[model samples]
Target chain A: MSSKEEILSILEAFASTERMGSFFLDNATADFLFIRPSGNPLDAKGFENMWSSGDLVLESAEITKVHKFELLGSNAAICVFTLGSKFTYKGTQNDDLPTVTSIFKKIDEKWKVAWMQRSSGQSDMTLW
Target chain B: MSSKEEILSILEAFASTERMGSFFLDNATADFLFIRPSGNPLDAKGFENMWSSGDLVLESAEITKVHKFELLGSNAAICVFTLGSKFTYKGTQNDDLPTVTSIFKKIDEKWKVAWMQRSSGQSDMTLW
Candidate 1:
């Protein structure tokens, strides 16, 4: 929570975090943005629908590498990491590797994601 | 420069801004990450080489939409916006539209980009 490495570890751990969908809904800012590999973008409300519906289901995911990570001032952090995951999207279970980036913020004394974009899940679904 | 809208304009105006390459080098954090549509990620040093070399050349770019924007604490801002750009990578000039996400911070009383990833230039070059 204090060190940059610690924050990276926390980000990597989020792949397998329990109730991840719920976690995101609670941990993301009101304006959180999640961009898919296909160039589609989604907002916090879109996250709710995807988290609620069964269109996408994630089984397992892990961080493979940390490409870059930075802390701006004290309350904001940005990073790029590689993630490997198994998810049933639409209906097929596929092994996916995504280059992930995130803008993390200290909101209400907790780290909340404000922006994110990943180069994965292109064929998974269409979210605009 | 204080309002959220002002920042958006500033980001969008970067397309036709002066000394674009030089601007990024001076305004980006030491660990800045720029993810191209091809899933390739680059660091600040890599960016320096690209800016110094003619491997990549940008003509114009503009913000099409602001998908999301948020300010964390007082010194950090996060945003997702659609950007259309014309850039020559390698030997081809590409008209590319990419979804961009950035973590902007107030450093030394000025806004500096800490992290950014865009979904463009996938076919321009292999920037690994």
Candidate 2:
């Protein structure tokens, strides 16, 4: 039973990883899904490969804003955040700052991110 | 009591409007928030202005997929969809197809959109 804050910290830590594929596989739900700014959809395994291929790396990450939601009588929670990060993809510096919205479901007493969307753009609105 | 199908139709209708500001104001929650693909955040009033300014118009729209989520013991539901639309913004043709995630809540047994995010990218993921 992890608090919302703890899960959020995991997200932050997850973003700062050099090995994203393994980390994401460990933390995300079995049916986890991801969509990139290019409109590419990836499942848990596909996302893992994107990280493990070594073409993408998050040098550092700063989570500027975060909001969490807990649904009553349901094992579902959501976290939306604005992430500013320095990235090196294929050894090239990337300047896109993406806002992310993720849904988590508690399964078997553990919280795992089930759905994730990353928007490569800036916005002042806190809600996804 | 509106069914999920009806609410979804409203969303489709809402997207095809020339008068987006007024329509959204009538359909969205008072605290409605919007974030664009450019990472710009707008509240209810700001969003209204964006629509009412006559700078953005949906010439046509085709919704490819939609999935809904209902939060137990809560008045909230979420609709995630992939929208392919032809748009004219500031008298220029816009070629971006975006995925959208919107949150709606039932108040007084009436549904209103509370949050909306538009991703100006493409992806096959069904979830936002």
Candidate 3:
């Protein structure tokens, strides 16, 4: 269920989505953990709050590069990507945004994000 | 097989990992990828070569903070942690490393690291 094309599509969806963590919540593990570009960590609930607060309202994410994408059997996969994004945090869509790594666990029949890590960006502010 | 006590022991062992990726080689998947804190991604062999490159000499890594550790139905697990360690890379001891996340997959009753991600450090230099 995690073909390369499909995964790219998934990332594309993630990049294009206007909502922060809303759609991702549907494809996340209950113990989902997302690290912001500022080095702050967020759990599923905090992520939801980020969406609810409407802080990430003005944003655009484009997957500029894919460093790694490897499938582990039929149960898991690992993805690392660099996205050029305009956070417009209410805003430089970063040219050197942090590298993003995601561990996808296949649940039921689809690949769901189990844990995601974003390296510290050059900026001190939190972007997505 | 992946009890908290056991996991701690594993971390402790990893902190004192003398031979670099030797021990980790045994506990990693065939497609195992370890992203350095410098945003450089390495495969199992590349990781071993990094050890041979004298880059990660005598590094001491300890779990400074554990943000997440949750089991996935006894067959898989996810771990997020921050380590305080000095990567005495041929000289200077840099301690403030990036956040770490590991995905563990149980194979034959043992929890092995399937994927490990280390966020980028402040240093622009590629210090594993």
Candidate 4:
């Protein structure tokens, strides 16, 4: 397996607001498959629908901070990241200040997110 | 730094649905820190407040699956976990079945959760 350097490389490469398609890989070929933010039951297509269906895509993203953890008895790990960015939906700009957690597994000598969930960032909308 | 095996030891040691306090760490001295779920702005104390204030503590949690990711330009990793479990709140057993995403960073040759967030798990409550 690769070191943390290799793992981060993938995240950086894939985490782009410019192109949503870059976020996913070939699930069938990938030994382990899952979604980001931990507990989401969505597969690759589901994420595509969620992100693409929205009228406005994310404008920009920043990984403010990050943390990592390893699971017991397996090549599983957890990572927490703080994100500050903006997203556009329905011609409106929304501040996407959220915390994300990603779980990864080392399958076939590579690390990949098994499941992940992003909290619904509180905004003016939640209060209403 | 200890290998991923050493890190997993800690997660396994603490991930008990039975006790909530076992989930958090003393955040001040820990290097490269944040919260679980990757994008949260909450500190350790904040997590304690959120988890404790809730009427129901998680009853039991099962890591249905796991994934791992590494960040670029820093010592960071992301873990996504699929969870299936139940909770007890207000004398009722509610399914606390939510997806979780955790972000982590390597500090002082070790990994720790920087941030994590859970989605509003769909249920009877949300539908109303």
What CAPRI class is candidate 4? incorrect
Per-candidate Cα lDDT values, in order, are 0.68, 0.68, 0.65, 0.52
For model 1, name the residue pairs that clash: none
lDDT of 3 by residue, A53-102 (tens): 65555366777777667665567676778766666444424344666787
Best of the candidates, TM-score: 2
Q: Pairs clashing in candidate 3? A: A86-A93, A88-A91
Off by over 4 Å in 2: A1-3, A67-74, A121-128, B1-3, B67-74, B121-128
TM-score for each predicted model, relative to the true structure: 0.70, 0.80, 0.67, 0.53
Model 1's i-RMS, to one decimal, reads 9.0
Off by over 4 Å in 4: A27-40, A69-77, A122-128, B1-97, B100-117, B123-128
For candidate 4 chain B, which ten residues in a row score worst on lDDT? B27-36
- Model 1 Cα lDDT, one tens digit per residue, B71-100: 766787877677777888899987877677
TM-score of chain B of each: 0.74, 0.78, 0.79, 0.63
Ranking by DockQ: 2, 1, 4, 3
lDDT of 4 at B127: 16
DockQ value for model 4: 0.19
Runs in model 1 lying further than 4 Å from the true structure:
A1-14, A48-57, A67-75, A88-93, A121-128, B1-13, B48-57, B88-93, B120-128
CAPRI-style quality class for the chain A–B interface of candidate 3: incorrect
DockQ of each: 0.22, 0.39, 0.18, 0.19
